[PDB]
Structures are given as C-alpha cells and as structure tokens.
C-alpha cells in the first residue's frame, strides 16, 4: 500500500522520542516478591493525602449548588403553605 | 556510582524465596479465577438460548 | 509435586476448570436453595397445604 | 515472524489489544472505553432475543412486554437487564466525556477523535428515544408528543416535517411501528463509528495524566491493561447484578406501567434521568422556535473546545484555577437534571435560567480567560525582569 | 494556541510597572507552589505540550547535555506517579533552579516563522 | 503529498477505488464484484422501508403486505424491486463464483479470499430463505414445513433441535416472528464479511485471464475502471427495471398469493428457482438422515478445489481437455434444477441420482484426473527424448 | 501442486518406450496446437505460475539476457489480449523455439528442497 503521514507515535524501536543516554533501571520478579503488601502503609497515610490534598477544590463548588438548591426548595414550600398566600399572587404577577 | 551495586530491595524481598511455594499460591489464584469464569459463561448462554424454547401459553394448549 | 499434577499440564489446567465446573453447578445450587427455604420456612406453599389439608 | 503478525485478521487483533505501546502511568479512568464496548454487545444481544418476542402494532405493543415478563422463560431478566442495562450505559459515557475534559483528550493531535465521538453521542439519545416509545406506556405516548411537537416551528417546511415523522396527524400506529424498525437500525450504525473511533486512536495513541509525552516508556497491553480490565468489568457486572435482580424498578417511572391514553394527560411528564439536564435548557426559552435551536446548541458547543483552550499546558492536573471552574460546570449539570424534574413554579424558572447560562459561559467566556491568565502567571514566577 | 511571544509581551509590561510588579508577582509565587509540579522533579519547560512544528524545531536545537537531562526527569516523574507518591525532599527542584532553558530557542523559531509568513503574503507598490 | 493520501479515512478510499494498481487485461467478467455490492445496497435499502409498515404475527403477516400493495404510496414499487432485486442477486453471484472456476482464482495466495466467499454464500442462502417465510403464503408455510422437519433426523438432539426451531410443536405464530428478527440480521453479518472480503483482496490484488504475472503492467482504477463498471452498472439496472416494471410476477409461483392453511397441503411443494438444484440433490437420497448431509455436502464440497487441482498452470484458457468439462458441469446444474421442479416420477429419479454423481465426480475424480493427464501432455510434445 | 520431477519422471518413460512414444506423441502435438499460447508469442515456461519458493529461486538465477527477453514477451502478450486479436502470422513463436529454457533451473532447486527435507527429519541407528 502508500505510505502513511506523519504522526507523532511510532513502534518497538522506533517509537520516536528524544536519544536516551545514562540511565540505568532495576528490577525484580514477581514470584520472588512478598504477597500482597498494601493494605497497610497505603490506607494508613497514603490514601488520605491523595484526596484531602485535593478535597478543597470539589468542596468549595459543592457547597455553593447544595446551599443554593436547600435555599430555593424551602422559599417553593413557603409560597404554596397558607402563610405564603399573599406573596404567591404577587410574584406569579 | 557504580552501575555493578545495585540499589536496596530488601522492603520488598521475601525472607525465603522457596520457588515452589511461591508459583503454587499465584496458580491458586488464577485457577480458581478461570473455573469460577467457566462456569460463569455456561449458564449466562443457556438463560439466552432457553428463552427460545416453548412459552408458557404455548405448552398450555399441549 | 503439586504445581506440576495441578497446573503445568495445560491439557487438564483447561480441563480441569472446564471440569470441576460442572460438578460445582449441582454442588452450588443445592446449598443455597437449602438456606433460602430454610430461612423462609413457614411462608412457602408446601408449608401451607401441610395443614390447609383440613 | 509469529503468526499474531503475518496473518491478516490477526495482525489487526494483535495491533490493538496485544502489542499495541501503552504509557505506563495511566490511571482507571482510562478503562472506561472498553466498559462502554461491553455495554453496546449487552444492549444487542438483549435486544434480538426480545425481538422474537415482540409485536410493534399499537394495539398490541404494551401486551406484548407483558407477554415477555410473564410468559417467555427468562423473560424478565432480558427486560431488567436490557432497561438498567440503557442507564449504565449513560452514565459510563458521562465520565468517559468528563476524563476528556479534565486531561485535554480534546487538543491536537486528536481533534479527529474528539468529533466522532461526539456524533457517537448523538446517535445514542436518538436511540434511547425510539426504544422508550416501544413500550407504549403512558409516559411512551406524551413524551413523543412533546418532542414532535417542536419541530412545527421551523419556518416554511416545519408542519411538513412533523407529518412526515408521525405518518398522519397524530401519535398513532404508523408512528410506533416506524419507531421500532429505527430503533433496530441505529445501534449498527454506531457499532460503524466505534471502529473509525477505534482507527482514529490507533494513530496517535492516548495520553496520560501527566498531560506530558508518553514515547520515552511504555508497556505492552496483554497481560498488564487486560487483567487490569478485568478488575473494573467484575465491579460493573455486579453493580449492574444488584439493580437487576434486587431493585428493578428504581431508575424507571411508574407512569409507563400505564397502558397510553391520547385522551388523558398526566400530572407530570418527565424524561429518564440522563435526559433531564437538557430538558430543562429547552423549558428556560419562552420562545418555542429559539428554544429547540438552544436544546441542539448544547450538544454541539463541544465541538469549539479545541479552538477556546488557550493554554501551552495540556490538561487540568497543574492548574488550580481550571480546577476549581471544572467542578462548578460538574455540580451545574447535577442541578440542571434537577430542575428538569420539578414543576414550572418560581423560583425554579429563574434557577434554571441562570445555570444555562453558566453551562455555555463555561465553554465560550471561562475557558478562554483563565487560560489565558494562567500562561502569564506561570512566565512573571519565574522570570527575573 | 496562545504564542510564547504574546505572553512575553504582556508579561514584560507587568514586570516593568512598579505598582503592577507588586500585586501580582506575589499572587505567581503562590500559584506555582500551588501547581506541584517541582514536587514530581519537573521543571517548567518540561511541561510544554511538544505535537506541533515549532516545538520539534526548538527540541532539535537543544545541547545534548540538556536533552539527556530532559529525559531523565521525564522518566522519573512518569514512574512517581504511577507509584502514586512523591519524591524525597530533598530530591525537589528548588526555585533558583526552575529556569526557563527551552524559551530562547522557541522564541527564535516563532520569529523566524512569523517573518516567513509575512513575506509569502505581500503587496508592491511602483 | 496530497490530502487523499494524508488523512486517516480518505486514504483507505483512495488505495481501494483510486490509486488501486489494476492488470491491464481482465475483461467484463471481472466487473461482478461491484454489481454485487450495489444489489445489497439495494436489498437494504428497500428492506427498512418496507419494514416500517410490516406486522409479523401470523394473523396479520398476509395482509401486511397486500397493505404494502394497495396503500402504501409508491408501495408496490418497493415490493417489485425487493422480490425481483433478490433473483438477480442470486444471479450474478453464480456468475462470480463461475468465473473463479474458470480462471483458477481459487489456487494459491488467494485461498483465504475464495474461502471467506464461500460462507458469504451460505449466509445469503439462509437470508433468502427466511424473508421467504414471512409473506406466509402458501408456499411459504409449506416450503418451512418441509426444510424443519429435516432436522429431526439427526441422533439423540435431532426432535429437540426442531422443536427449539419452532417455538411449539409446529410452524406457527413464535415461528414466524423470530424469522423476521433474524431476516433483519444476517445482511447486517454479510456486509461485515464483505469487508473481510475486501481486505484479502487488497493484498494480493486480482488476477488476470492470461493466468500469468500482472506485475510488470498496471494501471490505476480511477476513470479507466470506473467507467468501465458504468456500462455494466446501467445494464443492470435497465434490465432489472424491464422486470419490475413490465412483468413483475414471472419469477414467482401463484401459490403464494393463497393464504397459508396448515389443513391445505398444495399438489406441488416448489423452492424459488435459484435453490432447485440443491432440492433435487436432496430428493434423490432415501434415507432421510444421508440426504440432508449430502444437501449441506453440495456447498462445503467448494473447499476442496485448491487441493485437488494439480495443475502446472492456472486458468482454463490454455486448456482444451479443462474446457470441455467445465461446460459438462455448468448444463449438469441446469439440468438439476429443472429435475427439481417436476414431480416424483419416472424417469426423473434415475436422472437426479446420476446428475447428482456428476456433481460430486467432478470436484473429486474428473479435476485431479484431467489436471494430471495436461501436466504430461506440455512435456512430451516439446522434450525431444 | 504437482512437481516437475514426478511430471519429468512419468514422461521420460513413455518417450523411451518405442510402443507409447508412437501414441501418445501424436496426440500432444494436436494438444498444444489446439491450445494456441504460440499465437500470443509465448513458449510454454512462460506460463508457469510463479507464486511459490521454488519458482522464485529459479527465476533469480536466470541469466539477465534471458530475463529481459522473458518480460518482453509477458508485456507484449498483455496488449494483444486486450485489443481482441492475434499477432500476424510471421511474430508467432516457432516449435524449434519453444524450448525449455526454465525447467534445469527449476529441477536443480526441487532436488536440494528435497536433500534438505530428509536431513531434517531423519533417523539413526547405533
Ligand atoms: C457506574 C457503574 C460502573 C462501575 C465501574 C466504574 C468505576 C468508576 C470509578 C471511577 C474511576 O474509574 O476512577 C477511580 C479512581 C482511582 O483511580 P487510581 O488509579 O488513581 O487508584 C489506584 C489505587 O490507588 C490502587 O488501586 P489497586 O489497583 O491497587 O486496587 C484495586 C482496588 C479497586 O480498584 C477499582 O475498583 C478501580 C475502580 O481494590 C481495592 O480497593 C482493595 C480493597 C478492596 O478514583 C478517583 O480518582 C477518586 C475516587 C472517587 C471516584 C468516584 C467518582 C465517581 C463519580
Ligand atoms: C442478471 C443479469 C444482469 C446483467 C447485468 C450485466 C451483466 C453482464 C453479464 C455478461 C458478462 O459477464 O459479460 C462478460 C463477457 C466478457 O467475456 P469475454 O472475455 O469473452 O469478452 C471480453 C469483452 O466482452 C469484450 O468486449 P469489447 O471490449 O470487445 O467491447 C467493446 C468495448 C465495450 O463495448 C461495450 O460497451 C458493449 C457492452 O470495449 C472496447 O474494447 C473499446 C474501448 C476503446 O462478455 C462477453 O462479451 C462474452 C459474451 C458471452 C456473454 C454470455 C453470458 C452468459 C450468461
Ligand atoms: C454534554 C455532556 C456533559 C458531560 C458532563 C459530565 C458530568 C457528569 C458527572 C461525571 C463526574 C465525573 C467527574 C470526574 C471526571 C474524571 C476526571 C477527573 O476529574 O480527574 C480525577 C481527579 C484528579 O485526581 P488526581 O489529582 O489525583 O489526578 C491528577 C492526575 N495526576 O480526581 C477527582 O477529583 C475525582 C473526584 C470525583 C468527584 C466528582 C463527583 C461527581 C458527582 C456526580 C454525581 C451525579 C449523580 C447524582
Ligand atoms: C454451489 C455451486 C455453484 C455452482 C456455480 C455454477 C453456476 C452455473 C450457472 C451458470 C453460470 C454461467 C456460466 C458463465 C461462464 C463463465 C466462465 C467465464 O468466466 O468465461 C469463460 C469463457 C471465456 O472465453 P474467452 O474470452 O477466454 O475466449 C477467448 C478465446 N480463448 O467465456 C465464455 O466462453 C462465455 C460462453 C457463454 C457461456 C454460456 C453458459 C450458459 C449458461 C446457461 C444459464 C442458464 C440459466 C437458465
Ligand atoms: C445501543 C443500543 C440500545 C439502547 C440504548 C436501547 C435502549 C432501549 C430503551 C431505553 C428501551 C425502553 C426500555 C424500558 O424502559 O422498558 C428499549 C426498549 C426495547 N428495545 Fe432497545 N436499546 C438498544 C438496542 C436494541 C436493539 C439492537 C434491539 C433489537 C434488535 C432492541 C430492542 C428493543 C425492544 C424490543 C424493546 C421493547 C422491550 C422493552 O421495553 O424492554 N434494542 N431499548
Ligand atoms: C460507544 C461509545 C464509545 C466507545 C466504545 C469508546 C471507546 C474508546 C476507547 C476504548 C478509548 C481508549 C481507552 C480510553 O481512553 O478509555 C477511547 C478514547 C477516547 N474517547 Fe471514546 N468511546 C466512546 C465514546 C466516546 C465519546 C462519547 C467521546 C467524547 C465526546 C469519546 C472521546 C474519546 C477521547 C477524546 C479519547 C482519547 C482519550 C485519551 O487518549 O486520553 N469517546 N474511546
Ligand atoms: C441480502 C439482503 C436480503 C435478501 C436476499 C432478502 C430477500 C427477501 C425475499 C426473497 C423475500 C420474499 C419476497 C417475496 O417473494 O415476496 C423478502 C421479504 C421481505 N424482506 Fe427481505 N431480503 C434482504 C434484506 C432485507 C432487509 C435488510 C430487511 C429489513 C430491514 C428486509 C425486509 C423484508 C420484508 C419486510 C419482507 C416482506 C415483504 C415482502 O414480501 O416483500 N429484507 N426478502
Ligand atoms: C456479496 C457478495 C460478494 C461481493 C460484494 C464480492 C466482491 C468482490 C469484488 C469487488 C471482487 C474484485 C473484483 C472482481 O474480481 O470481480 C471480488 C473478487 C473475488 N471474489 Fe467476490 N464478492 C462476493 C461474493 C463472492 C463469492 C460468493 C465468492 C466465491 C465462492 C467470491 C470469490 C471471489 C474471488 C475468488 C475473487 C478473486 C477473483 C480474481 O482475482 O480473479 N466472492 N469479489
Ligand atoms: C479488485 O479491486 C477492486 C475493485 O475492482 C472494485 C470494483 C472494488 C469496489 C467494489 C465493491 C463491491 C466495494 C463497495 C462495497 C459495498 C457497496 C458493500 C456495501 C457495504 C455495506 C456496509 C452495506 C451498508 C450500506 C447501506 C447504505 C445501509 C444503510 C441504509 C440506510 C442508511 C437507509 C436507512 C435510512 C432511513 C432514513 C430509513 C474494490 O473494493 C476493489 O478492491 C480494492
Ligand atoms: C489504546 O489502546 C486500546 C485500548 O485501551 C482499548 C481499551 C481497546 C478496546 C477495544 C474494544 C473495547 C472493542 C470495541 C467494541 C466493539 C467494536 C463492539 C462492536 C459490537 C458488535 C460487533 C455487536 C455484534 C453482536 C452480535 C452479532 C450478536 C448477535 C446475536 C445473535 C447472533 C443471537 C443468536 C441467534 C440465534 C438464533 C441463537 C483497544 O482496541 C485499544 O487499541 C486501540
Ligand atoms: C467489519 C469490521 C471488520 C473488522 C475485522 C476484524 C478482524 C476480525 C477477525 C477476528 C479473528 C479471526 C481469526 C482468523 C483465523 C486466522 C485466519 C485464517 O485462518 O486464514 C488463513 C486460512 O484461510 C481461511 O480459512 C480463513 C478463515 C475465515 C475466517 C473468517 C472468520 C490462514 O492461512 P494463511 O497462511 O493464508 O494466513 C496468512 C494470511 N495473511
Ligand atoms: C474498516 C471499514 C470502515 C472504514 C470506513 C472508511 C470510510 C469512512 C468514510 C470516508 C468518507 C470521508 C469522510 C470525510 C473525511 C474528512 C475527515 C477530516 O476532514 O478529518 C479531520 C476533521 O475531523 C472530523 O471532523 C472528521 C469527521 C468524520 C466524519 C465521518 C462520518 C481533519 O482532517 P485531518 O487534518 O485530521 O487529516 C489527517 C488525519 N490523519
Ligand atoms: C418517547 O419519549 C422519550 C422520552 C425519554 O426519556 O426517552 C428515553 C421522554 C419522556 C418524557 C419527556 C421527554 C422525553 O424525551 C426527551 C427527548 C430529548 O431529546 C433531546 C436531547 C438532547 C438534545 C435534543 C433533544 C431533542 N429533541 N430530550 C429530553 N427528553
Ligand atoms: C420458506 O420456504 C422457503 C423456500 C424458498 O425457496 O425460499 C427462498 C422453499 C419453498 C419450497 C420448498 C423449499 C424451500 O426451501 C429450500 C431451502 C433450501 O435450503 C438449502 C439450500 C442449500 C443447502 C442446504 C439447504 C437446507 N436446508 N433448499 C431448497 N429449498
């Protein structure tokens, strides 16, 4: 077939990123490794840090729509109760 | 430094390596993971493949 | 040793997980049905015709 | 060379899901393509067995799903299984579309997978439609009423196009008998696109949540990503196990076990659930022909995100402004399903009037301006002047 | 999308003004300690997204002792992340460290481009 | 290089129908591969609107389609098309496979590509069969009757494969409303395949007449191939519309304008004419259990010709002896029909049982034999010993 | 499918037999005639079909001289064909000239195929 275009991803070997140089890396089988080592040194610490770092930025949106949605739910019941009578035909104007 | 030390593992290392205990138990486990899968499949295809067969108001009139 | 007459022979390690499910089937079937009836028991019919029998 | 990679059919499977180069720090929101892969086979292997079963005639459409509850064995569990079935398969698309948001998926080099998948989603509502008007419920009957009856405010073709798409002048039998042979059709269309969606990724590969390049290590995909797929496929299965056979009817209206009634109007007519945020952008226009433009806006306004990000950086993992803004647009969709589910009664006219607006001010005003101001901010900390 | 040489442009004014230098210069130092990206070993410039012609140009014109270290931090911080942990203290990249090395050689490239452009698109006059 | 080359879903067009390099010298039997294309294209189309006005119940199925005729505007046009559409599909098909015989396409490299055409055969055989049923005539509830009832034969599953067939104990209501489900399926798995079809293909490329290397002169498809698929194309299309149009019910039988009555049995039980000669290869069997085998044998039979031709050379062309039995066996399948069309009689059941053994001999004994004998002929007419 | 050497074998003993030579040899000089590749202007080891390892090695060792003379006549027997007509009558190839030129190729490379295939699979004996 033709020839394709230029993309920025090839294959084993020729994947296409920058000439490597000086590294050395290590490793170590699996089947000479202790079973199962976390649920311990990762739920003590390791799996409160990774939200509670972050908890400030989905909390502050929450709390906005959960005040603004209880706010307005409780004027809908006002107006439709026998106190609210009166209001009820001034904003439905 | 040199490239001939190599790092610290010993976090991770069992205290004894013993390789037939330590394939038998990882064995164990994707055993019983492919019969529990077979078993699984077997009856997921005969709840499709019954549902075919004659309905209730069918055998009714038999 | 128990590796190689369990799971190195992969002729049977596909067999015996096509085997040993078949009879896990009955086996599986048998006790939860037993449980279910028994922690129901006094609501099903067959407890109701034994004394709707008059 | 192996036969993986010499046979033809078989290069192809080991391109994809064998050998094929992943970055090794991907983390499991990137497993969610391959659940929605598994919903689309549930959704059709489902559908032909009730087809055997079923008879489009609006006199015999509502019986005929009694008649598959009551009478065909195992009959119950193919309805349960295929109408709970339709909602996870919305809400693993809604956080498949929010990974893509948060990680930049939409920048260049892959603008050509971002725009089919939004034809994919699409073809889906369209598809969830036609099934839901196949029961014939009471809720079957007005809400196609409703949805039809917007079309009749085009200009000079719009009370043509809505007698063509009832086939007389009304809801009727010409209309559920042609809604079901649609409703057989489309899920292969979308199976189509889900391979060119599959062609388009092959190309460039995926990202990871460093937003950084991924060619320097990688890992093959068997026996790494396909036993971590199998962790993410047994905790859907049983979810999807626990609304099946333990609650039923909980994602569902009790309306549609109604038999319909042209004569007689319900007290409420409400959409499923993955549905209501944009019936209630269409109730927040008083104008009837500039509220069905708004309602179709707000699918396609996802097609300008390559153009409206400002930013040198791809993706939100080091930007503490584009953060906070993405959590706001998440709790404003939760709110605007909401108020679709509520009466017109003040003060949820005036709510729902305000969160439209922030949904396409998020996409046209927001995204562009805190962009901007982070590439600046990042500079003026760093440089000496 | 936004070019580096717009964002030097209006980064230069603010640095310059004394009243401007003041109020959000302070408001810089605590978004990019914010940021974390000096946590994971990363410098700035290796954040840039690299899939576009002016990026390759800058990236082969780099000094190879340069690249060498590039790789090596981006490597590094692929394998903290997976890990799901941070690095060591003291293996952080300070302040005085967070330089911009690549933003000479995209600057020059993005100039050379602009007057290429320029030329190709031209009137004349008698 | 050019944008048609470039982009990931228009360089798949352009080297199928563009740029692909043709041999210079195939002639006008090499252009039934597309008007097979356009005829499911058409088989389609035709069949989603049709089915928009369709009941399958067994008391509404007849009437249904003389609802088609008489109401449905343009409604006849889509029936007459779809019913004609269907033997003429059937007809060019047979002169595709008829030509891979001839010019030995079927030999090496190109043994996938005639292999994955031969279950795209069988697949169509079966869509025609079951959309026959559900005009339930006459003829089609008799002509069901008679092909389910051979599978009760087979040992120890056979009276439960049948009953599982059926839905009950006889062809009735269940039977004819999962054929329609199943009528709608396999042309959506036979355009899958086609696809598969495609890609061997591309591969190799086709061959030529001359048997011969076609390496060393190509020419590209655009405007050369192109136009020369447009007369075939406007041929077939003038042809079919004289059918349509002018004489729409010579290719059918009058017993299925009668209403289907199991107490009724007709005095002739007839297939369409493209499947009389596998219903006389079965009539001519005793024993009921050896003839459905020797019905399915007739079509898997195709498989063994890449093993039993032992030719030096492929094609027919040079070959006067291959010649000759090669038209032996194309008025052997003519006769065969037309035996499969008259009654149990003498003399008709001695020659179906010797027309039969010509059919098998000729894939089995006259192909190696022959092929054998022209390998030597080459060599002794030129070694001078 | 059928090997030249077992092709070679069953026509070498009917042409050194004085009984079958007079039958047979007759009857392929009709055979050929009747087929009609010489009108086209090609000799027979033209038209063998070359799609497999043993029919690639022996075109490679073709002499060069005869290699463009083989793909002259390839070319040339493509034009007639799609014109519908034959060449003239002194361009048709001569039975002097139809010779086998490619068979001592193709019969040295079936042997070695053959000498390798029994190395492989073999046995001994103490
Ligand atoms: C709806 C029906 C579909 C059902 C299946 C869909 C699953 C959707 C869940 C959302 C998701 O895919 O992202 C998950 C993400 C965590 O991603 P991560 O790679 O950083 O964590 C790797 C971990 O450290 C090691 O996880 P590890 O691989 O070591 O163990 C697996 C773990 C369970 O893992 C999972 O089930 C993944 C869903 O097993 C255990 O917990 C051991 C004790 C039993 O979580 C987060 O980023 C934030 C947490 C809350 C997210 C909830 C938001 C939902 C709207
Ligand atoms: C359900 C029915 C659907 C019908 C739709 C159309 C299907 C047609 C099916 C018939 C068919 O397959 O025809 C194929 C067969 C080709 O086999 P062949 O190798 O012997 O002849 C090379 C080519 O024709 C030369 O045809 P020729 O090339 O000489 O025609 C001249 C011109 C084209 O003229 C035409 O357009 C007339 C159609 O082309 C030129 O050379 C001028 C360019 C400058 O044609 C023949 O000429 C052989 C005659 C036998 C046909 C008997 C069919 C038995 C079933
Ligand atoms: C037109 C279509 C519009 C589509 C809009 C879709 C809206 C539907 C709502 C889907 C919610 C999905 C939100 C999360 C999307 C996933 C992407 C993401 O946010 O990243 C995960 C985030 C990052 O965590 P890290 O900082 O540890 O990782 C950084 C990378 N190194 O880690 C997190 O912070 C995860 C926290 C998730 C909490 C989100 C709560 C959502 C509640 C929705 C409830 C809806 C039902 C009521
Ligand atoms: C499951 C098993 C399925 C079996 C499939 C068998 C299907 C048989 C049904 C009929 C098919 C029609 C056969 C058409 C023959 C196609 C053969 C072909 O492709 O071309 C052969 C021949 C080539 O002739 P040349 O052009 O090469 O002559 C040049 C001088 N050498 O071209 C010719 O000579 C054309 C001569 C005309 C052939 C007349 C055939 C008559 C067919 C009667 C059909 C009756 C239907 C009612
Ligand atoms: C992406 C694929 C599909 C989706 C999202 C989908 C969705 C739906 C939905 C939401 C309903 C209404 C269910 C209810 O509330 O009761 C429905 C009904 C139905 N669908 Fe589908 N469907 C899909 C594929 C199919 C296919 C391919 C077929 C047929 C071959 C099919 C056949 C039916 C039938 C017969 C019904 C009526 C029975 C019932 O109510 O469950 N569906 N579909
Ligand atoms: C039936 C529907 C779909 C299927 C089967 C599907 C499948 C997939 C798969 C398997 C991947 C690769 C793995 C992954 O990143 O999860 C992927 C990636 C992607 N999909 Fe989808 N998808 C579907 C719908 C969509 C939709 C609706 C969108 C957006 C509107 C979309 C946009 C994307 C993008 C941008 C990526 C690249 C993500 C990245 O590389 O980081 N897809 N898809
Ligand atoms: C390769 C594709 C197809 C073939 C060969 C085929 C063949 C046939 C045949 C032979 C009949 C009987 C016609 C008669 O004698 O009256 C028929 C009927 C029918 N088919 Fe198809 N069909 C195809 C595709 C489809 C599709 C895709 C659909 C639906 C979406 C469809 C819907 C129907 C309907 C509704 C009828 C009954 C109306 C009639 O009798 O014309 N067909 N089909
Ligand atoms: C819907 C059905 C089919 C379609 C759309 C189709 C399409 C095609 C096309 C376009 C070609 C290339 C052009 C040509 O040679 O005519 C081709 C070639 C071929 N087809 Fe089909 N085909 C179909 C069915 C079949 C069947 C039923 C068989 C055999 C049992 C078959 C066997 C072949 C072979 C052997 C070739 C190669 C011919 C050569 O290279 O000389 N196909 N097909
Ligand atoms: C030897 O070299 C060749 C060669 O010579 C030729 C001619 C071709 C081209 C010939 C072909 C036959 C290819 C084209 C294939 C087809 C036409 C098959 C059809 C494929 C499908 C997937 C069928 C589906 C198509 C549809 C239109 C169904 C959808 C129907 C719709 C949308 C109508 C319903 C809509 C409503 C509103 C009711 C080659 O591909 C080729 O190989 C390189
Ligand atoms: C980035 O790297 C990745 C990657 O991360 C992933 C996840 C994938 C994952 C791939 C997928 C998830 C595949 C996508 C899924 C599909 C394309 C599904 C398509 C759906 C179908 C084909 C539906 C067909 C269903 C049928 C034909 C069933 C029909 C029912 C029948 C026949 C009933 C039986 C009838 C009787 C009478 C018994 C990759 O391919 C990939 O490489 C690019
Ligand atoms: C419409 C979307 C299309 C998407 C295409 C996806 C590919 C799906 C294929 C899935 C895997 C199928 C495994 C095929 C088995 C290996 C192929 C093979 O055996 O080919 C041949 C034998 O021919 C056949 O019998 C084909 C069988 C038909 C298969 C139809 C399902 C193996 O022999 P060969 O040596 O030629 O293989 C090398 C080919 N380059
Ligand atoms: C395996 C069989 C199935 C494969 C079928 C292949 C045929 C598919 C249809 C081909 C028709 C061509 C479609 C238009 C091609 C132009 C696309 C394009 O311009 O690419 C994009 C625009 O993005 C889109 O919106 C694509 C919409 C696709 C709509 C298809 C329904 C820009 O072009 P780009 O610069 O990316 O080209 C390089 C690609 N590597
Ligand atoms: C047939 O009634 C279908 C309904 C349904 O929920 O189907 C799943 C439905 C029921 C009651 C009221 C409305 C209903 O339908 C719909 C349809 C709908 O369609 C769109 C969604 C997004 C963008 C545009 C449209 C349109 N039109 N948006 C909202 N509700
Ligand atoms: C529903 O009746 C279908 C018929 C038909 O012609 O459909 C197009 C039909 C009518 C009368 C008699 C028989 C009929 O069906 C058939 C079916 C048939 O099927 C096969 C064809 C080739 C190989 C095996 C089979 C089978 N079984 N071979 C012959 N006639």
């Keep these: 077939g033709p020839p394709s275009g230029k993309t920025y991803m090839g294959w084993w070997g020729h994947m296409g990123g920058p000439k490597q140089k000086g590294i050395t890396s290590y490793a170590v089988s699996p089947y000479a490794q202790k079973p199962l080592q976390g649920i311990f040194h990762n739920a003590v610490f390791n799996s409160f840090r990774r939200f509670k770092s972050q908890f400030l930025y989905v909390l502050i949106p929450a709390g906005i729509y959960w005040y603004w949605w209880k706010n307005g739910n409780e004027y809908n019941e006002f107006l439709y109760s026998k106190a609210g009578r009166e209001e009820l035909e001034r904003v439905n104007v | 430094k040199s490239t001939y030390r190599t790092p610290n593992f010993d976090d991770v290392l069992k205290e004894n390596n013993d390789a037939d205990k330590g394939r038998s138990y990882a064995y164990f486990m994707v055993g019983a993971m492919g019969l529990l899968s077979s078993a699984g499949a077997k009856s997921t295809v005969e709840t499709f493949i019954s549902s075919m067969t004659a309905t209730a108001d069918v055998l009714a009139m038999a | 040793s128990l590796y190689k007459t369990f799971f190195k022979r992969n002729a049977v390690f596909v067999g015996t997980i096509f085997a040993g499910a078949f009879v896990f089937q009955t086996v599986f079937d048998t006790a939860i049905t037993s449980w279910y009836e028994n922690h129901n028991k006094g609501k099903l019919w067959k407890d109701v015709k034994a004394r709707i029998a008059a | 060379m192996a036969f993986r990679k010499s046979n033809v059919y078989l290069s192809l499977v080991n391109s994809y899901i064998i050998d094929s180069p992943q970055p090794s720090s991907i983390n499991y929101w990137w497993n969610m393509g391959s659940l929605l892969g598994l919903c689309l086979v549930i959704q059709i292997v489902t559908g032909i067995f009730m087809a055997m079963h079923y008879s489009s005639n609006i006199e015999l459409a509502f019986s005929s799903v009694e008649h598959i509850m009551r009478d065909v064995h195992n009959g119950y569990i193919l309805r349960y299984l295929h109408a709970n079935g339709a909602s996870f398969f919305f809400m693993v698309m809604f956080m498949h579309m929010a990974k893509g948001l948060y990680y930049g998926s939409y920048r260049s080099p892959r603008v050509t997978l971002w725009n089919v998948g939004v034809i994919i989603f699409i073809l889906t509502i369209a598809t969830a439609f036609l099934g839901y008007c196949c029961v014939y419920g009471q809720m079957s009957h007005w809400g196609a009423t409703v949805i039809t009856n917007l079309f009749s405010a085009i200009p000079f073709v719009g009370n043509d196009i809505v007698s063509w798409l009832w086939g007389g002048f009304s809801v009727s039998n ?12 489309v899920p292969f269309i979308i199976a189509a696109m889900v391979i060119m969606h599959l062609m388009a990724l ?35 299965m049983l979810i999807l196990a626990l609304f099946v056979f333990y609650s039923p009817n909980t994602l569902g209206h009790p309306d549609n076990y109604i038999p319909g009634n042209p004569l007689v109007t319900p007290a409420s007519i409400v959409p499923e659930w993955y549905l209501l945020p944009f019936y209630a952008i269409l109730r927040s226009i008083p104008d009837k022909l500039l509220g069905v433009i708004t309602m179709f806006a707000a699918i396609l306004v996802l097609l300008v995100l390559p153009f409206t990000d400002r930013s040198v950086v791809r993706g939100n993992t080091f930007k503490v402004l584009s953060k906070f803004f993405f959590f706001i647009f998440v709790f404003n969709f939760v709110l605007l399903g909401q108020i679709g589910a509520c009466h017109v009664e003040v003060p949820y006219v005036l709510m729902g009037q305000i969160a439209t607006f922030i949904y396409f001010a998020y996409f046209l005003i927001i995204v562009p301006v805190i962009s901007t101001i982070e590439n600046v901010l990042f500079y003026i900390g760093r440089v000496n002047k | 999308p936004q070019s580096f040489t717009s964002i030097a442009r209006i980064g230069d004014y603010i640095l310059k003004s004394p009243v401007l230098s003041k109020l959000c210069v302070p408001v810089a130092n605590q978004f990019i300690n914010l940021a974390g990206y000096k946590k994971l070993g990363l410098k700035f410039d290796d954040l840039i997204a690299e899939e576009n012609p002016i990026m390759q140009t800058a990236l082969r014109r780099l000094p190879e002792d340069e690249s060498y270290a590039r790789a090596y931090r981006i490597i590094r911080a692929h394998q903290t992340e997976l890990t799901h942990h941070l690095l060591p203290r003291n293996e952080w990249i300070k302040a005085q460290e967070d330089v911009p090395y690549l933003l000479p050689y995209i600057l020059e490239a993005e100039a050379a481009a602009k007057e290429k452009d320029e030329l190709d698109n031209i009137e004349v006059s008698k």
């Excluded at chain 4, 949540?209 to 990503?225: A, C, E, K, Q, V």
């Excluded at chain 4, 396909?226 to 905790?235: E, N």
């Design chain 4, 202 to 236: 092959h190309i460039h590969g995926s990202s990871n949540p460093l937003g950084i390049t991924g060619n320097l290590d990688r890992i093959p995909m068997h026996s790494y990503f396909i036993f971590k797929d199998l962790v993410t496929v047994f905790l859907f």
């Design chain 4, 174 to 185: 010409p209309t559920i008998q042609r809604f079901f042979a649609l409703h057989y059709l």
